[PDB]
Design a protein around this nucleic acid. Structure first.
Length: 49
DNA sequence: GGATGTATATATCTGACACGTGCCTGGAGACTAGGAAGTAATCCCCTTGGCGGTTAAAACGCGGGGGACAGCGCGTACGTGCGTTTAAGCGGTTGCTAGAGCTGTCTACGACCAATTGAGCGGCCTCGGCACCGGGATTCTCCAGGGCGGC
Protein backbone atom coordinates (compact mmCIF):
# COMPACT_ATOMS: atom_id res chain seq x y z
CA UNK A 1 0.00 0.00 0.00
CA UNK A 2 3.09 2.29 -0.44
CA UNK A 3 3.17 2.82 3.36
CA UNK A 4 5.12 -0.33 4.28
CA UNK A 5 8.10 0.72 2.15
CA UNK A 6 11.20 -0.49 3.98
CA UNK A 7 14.86 0.52 3.84
CA UNK A 8 16.44 -2.83 2.99
CA UNK A 9 19.90 -4.14 2.14
CA UNK A 10 21.10 -6.90 -0.23
CA UNK A 11 22.04 -9.28 2.59
CA UNK A 12 18.81 -8.38 4.43
CA UNK A 13 16.65 -9.62 1.53
CA UNK A 14 17.94 -13.12 0.77
CA UNK A 15 16.21 -14.40 -2.38
CA UNK A 16 12.75 -13.02 -3.20
CA UNK A 17 10.94 -12.25 -6.44
CA UNK A 18 11.86 -9.04 -8.23
CA UNK A 19 15.48 -8.99 -7.03
CA UNK A 20 16.69 -8.18 -10.54
CA UNK A 21 14.43 -5.09 -10.55
CA UNK A 22 16.57 -3.84 -7.67
CA UNK A 23 19.66 -5.03 -9.57
CA UNK A 24 18.75 -2.91 -12.62
CA UNK A 25 17.83 0.03 -10.34
CA UNK A 26 21.07 -0.02 -8.31
CA UNK A 27 23.28 -0.89 -11.31
CA UNK A 28 22.33 1.59 -14.00
CA UNK A 29 21.22 4.42 -11.66
CA UNK A 30 24.57 4.30 -9.88
CA UNK A 31 26.38 4.07 -13.27
CA UNK A 32 24.93 7.25 -14.75
CA UNK A 33 24.96 8.98 -11.33
CA UNK A 34 28.71 8.46 -10.89
CA UNK A 35 29.19 9.07 -14.63
CA UNK A 36 27.61 12.52 -14.55
CA UNK A 37 29.27 13.31 -11.20
CA UNK A 38 32.76 12.35 -12.42
CA UNK A 39 32.52 13.80 -15.94
CA UNK A 40 34.28 17.17 -16.39
CA UNK A 41 32.09 17.79 -19.47
CA UNK A 42 29.00 18.65 -17.39
CA UNK A 43 27.27 22.03 -17.60
CA UNK A 44 25.16 23.67 -14.91
CA UNK A 45 21.94 23.35 -16.95
CA UNK A 46 22.18 19.55 -17.19
CA UNK A 47 22.84 19.05 -13.47
CA UNK A 48 20.01 21.41 -12.46
CA UNK A 49 17.46 19.79 -14.78
C1' DG B 1 -41.49 -11.72 12.06
C1' DG B 2 -37.95 -10.32 7.86
C1' DA B 3 -35.56 -11.43 3.53
C1' DT B 4 -34.07 -14.92 0.02
C1' DG B 5 -34.76 -18.62 -4.09
C1' DT B 6 -37.78 -19.65 -7.80
C1' DA B 7 -41.88 -19.82 -11.04
C1' DT B 8 -44.99 -17.36 -14.54
C1' DA B 9 -46.09 -13.34 -17.15
C1' DT B 10 -44.96 -9.08 -20.31
C1' DA B 11 -42.16 -5.89 -23.00
C1' DT B 12 -38.31 -5.58 -26.24
C1' DC B 13 -34.61 -7.23 -29.61
C1' DT B 14 -33.54 -9.73 -33.81
C1' DG B 15 -33.35 -13.00 -37.84
C1' DA B 16 -36.46 -14.46 -41.25
C1' DC B 17 -40.71 -14.49 -44.47
C1' DA B 18 -43.42 -12.19 -47.84
C1' DC B 19 -44.80 -8.11 -50.44
C1' DG B 20 -43.53 -4.54 -53.96
C1' DT B 21 -40.85 -2.76 -58.01
C1' DG B 22 -37.59 -2.22 -61.71
C1' DC B 23 -35.03 -4.03 -65.45
C1' DC B 24 -32.65 -6.53 -67.99
C1' DT B 25 -31.45 -10.75 -69.30
C1' DG B 26 -32.98 -15.19 -70.53
C1' DG B 27 -36.60 -17.68 -73.08
C1' DA B 28 -40.00 -18.43 -77.14
C1' DG B 29 -40.68 -18.36 -82.07
C1' DA B 30 -38.96 -18.02 -86.88
C1' DC B 31 -35.25 -18.20 -90.59
C1' DT B 32 -31.05 -19.39 -92.56
C1' DA B 33 -26.37 -21.08 -93.65
C1' DG B 34 -22.67 -23.88 -92.84
C1' DG B 35 -20.35 -27.40 -89.62
C1' DA B 36 -20.17 -31.72 -89.28
C1' DA B 37 -21.82 -36.48 -90.23
C1' DG B 38 -21.65 -39.83 -93.73
C1' DT B 39 -19.55 -42.13 -98.20
C1' DA B 40 -16.02 -43.77 -101.45
C1' DA B 41 -11.07 -44.19 -102.94
C1' DT B 42 -5.97 -44.49 -102.18
C1' DC B 43 -1.98 -45.31 -99.62
C1' DC B 44 0.95 -45.96 -95.72
C1' DC B 45 1.61 -47.34 -90.81
C1' DC B 46 0.59 -50.64 -87.06
C1' DT B 47 -0.65 -55.61 -85.18
C1' DT B 48 0.45 -60.62 -84.12
C1' DG B 49 2.89 -64.48 -84.56
C1' DG B 50 6.86 -66.35 -86.17
C1' DC B 51 12.52 -67.14 -87.98
C1' DG B 52 17.78 -66.07 -88.25
C1' DG B 53 22.16 -64.11 -86.77
C1' DT B 54 25.32 -60.51 -84.00
C1' DT B 55 26.66 -58.94 -80.23
C1' DA B 56 26.73 -56.05 -76.54
C1' DA B 57 24.15 -55.63 -72.51
C1' DA B 58 22.33 -58.06 -68.48
C1' DA B 59 22.89 -61.35 -64.89
C1' DC B 60 25.54 -63.92 -61.37
C1' DG B 61 29.18 -64.70 -58.15
C1' DC B 62 32.90 -63.14 -55.15
C1' DG B 63 36.28 -60.35 -52.67
C1' DG B 64 37.09 -56.18 -50.24
C1' DG B 65 37.02 -51.75 -48.59
C1' DG B 66 34.48 -47.40 -48.33
C1' DG B 67 30.72 -45.50 -46.31
C1' DA B 68 26.44 -45.53 -43.33
C1' DC B 69 25.22 -45.67 -38.75
C1' DA B 70 25.61 -45.86 -33.76
C1' DG B 71 27.66 -44.11 -29.61
C1' DC B 72 29.93 -40.53 -26.82
C1' DG B 73 31.70 -36.06 -25.46
C1' DC B 74 31.41 -31.10 -25.50
C1' DG B 75 30.46 -26.53 -25.97
C1' DT B 76 27.65 -23.28 -27.84
C1' DA B 77 23.66 -21.36 -29.29
C1' DC B 78 18.92 -21.27 -28.81
C1' DG B 79 14.85 -21.60 -25.64
C1' DT B 80 12.64 -19.56 -21.61
C1' DG B 81 11.32 -16.13 -18.48
C1' DC B 82 11.09 -11.40 -16.82
C1' DG B 83 11.29 -6.21 -16.99
C1' DT B 84 11.27 -2.35 -20.00
C1' DT B 85 10.33 0.12 -24.22
C1' DT B 86 7.95 0.99 -28.26
C1' DA B 87 5.15 1.01 -31.80
C1' DA B 88 0.88 -1.15 -33.60
C1' DG B 89 -3.98 -0.50 -33.38
C1' DC B 90 -7.89 2.56 -33.02
C1' DG B 91 -10.16 6.88 -33.53
C1' DG B 92 -9.67 11.54 -35.77
C1' DT B 93 -8.55 16.04 -38.89
C1' DT B 94 -8.43 18.18 -43.68
C1' DG B 95 -8.25 18.98 -47.91
C1' DC B 96 -7.45 17.18 -52.87
C1' DT B 97 -7.30 13.69 -56.29
C1' DA B 98 -7.98 8.99 -58.41
C1' DG B 99 -11.35 6.01 -59.86
C1' DA B 100 -15.91 3.52 -60.46
C1' DG B 101 -20.32 4.38 -62.43
C1' DC B 102 -23.38 6.66 -65.74
C1' DT B 103 -24.57 9.35 -69.96
C1' DG B 104 -23.51 11.26 -74.41
C1' DT B 105 -21.12 12.06 -79.08
C1' DC B 106 -18.28 10.88 -82.65
C1' DT B 107 -14.61 9.13 -85.38
C1' DA B 108 -11.04 6.20 -86.80
C1' DC B 109 -10.21 1.41 -87.05
C1' DG B 110 -11.16 -3.21 -87.93
C1' DA B 111 -14.51 -6.74 -89.97
C1' DC B 112 -16.05 -8.21 -94.51
C1' DC B 113 -16.07 -9.14 -99.48
C1' DA B 114 -14.25 -9.39 -104.31
C1' DA B 115 -10.16 -9.53 -107.52
C1' DT B 116 -5.36 -10.28 -107.87
C1' DT B 117 -1.01 -11.90 -107.58
C1' DG B 118 3.22 -13.25 -105.47
C1' DA B 119 5.28 -15.92 -101.77
C1' DG B 120 5.49 -20.89 -100.36
C1' DC B 121 5.99 -26.01 -101.69
C1' DG B 122 7.63 -29.49 -104.85
C1' DG B 123 10.66 -31.27 -108.74
C1' DC B 124 14.45 -30.52 -112.46
C1' DC B 125 19.04 -28.93 -114.03
C1' DT B 126 23.38 -27.35 -112.92
C1' DC B 127 27.86 -26.41 -110.04
C1' DG B 128 31.40 -27.33 -105.88
C1' DG B 129 33.61 -30.62 -104.19
C1' DC B 130 34.95 -35.49 -103.56
C1' DA B 131 36.35 -39.50 -105.74
C1' DC B 132 37.83 -43.18 -109.67
C1' DC B 133 41.07 -44.16 -113.55
C1' DG B 134 45.13 -43.38 -116.86
C1' DG B 135 49.87 -41.51 -117.66
C1' DG B 136 54.66 -39.47 -116.38
C1' DA B 137 58.66 -38.96 -112.90
C1' DT B 138 61.62 -41.05 -109.04
C1' DT B 139 63.92 -44.77 -106.20
C1' DC B 140 64.89 -49.83 -104.69
C1' DT B 141 66.36 -54.86 -105.40
C1' DC B 142 68.95 -57.93 -108.20
C1' DC B 143 72.08 -61.00 -111.78
C1' DA B 144 76.30 -61.30 -113.89
C1' DG B 145 81.60 -60.40 -114.91
C1' DG B 146 86.35 -59.68 -113.07
C1' DG B 147 89.96 -60.86 -109.85
C1' DC B 148 92.09 -63.87 -106.17
C1' DG B 149 93.02 -68.33 -103.64
C1' DG B 150 93.65 -73.62 -103.23
C1' DC B 151 95.12 -78.60 -104.84
Amino acid sequence: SHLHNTWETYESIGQVRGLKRLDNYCKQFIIEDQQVRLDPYVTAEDIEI
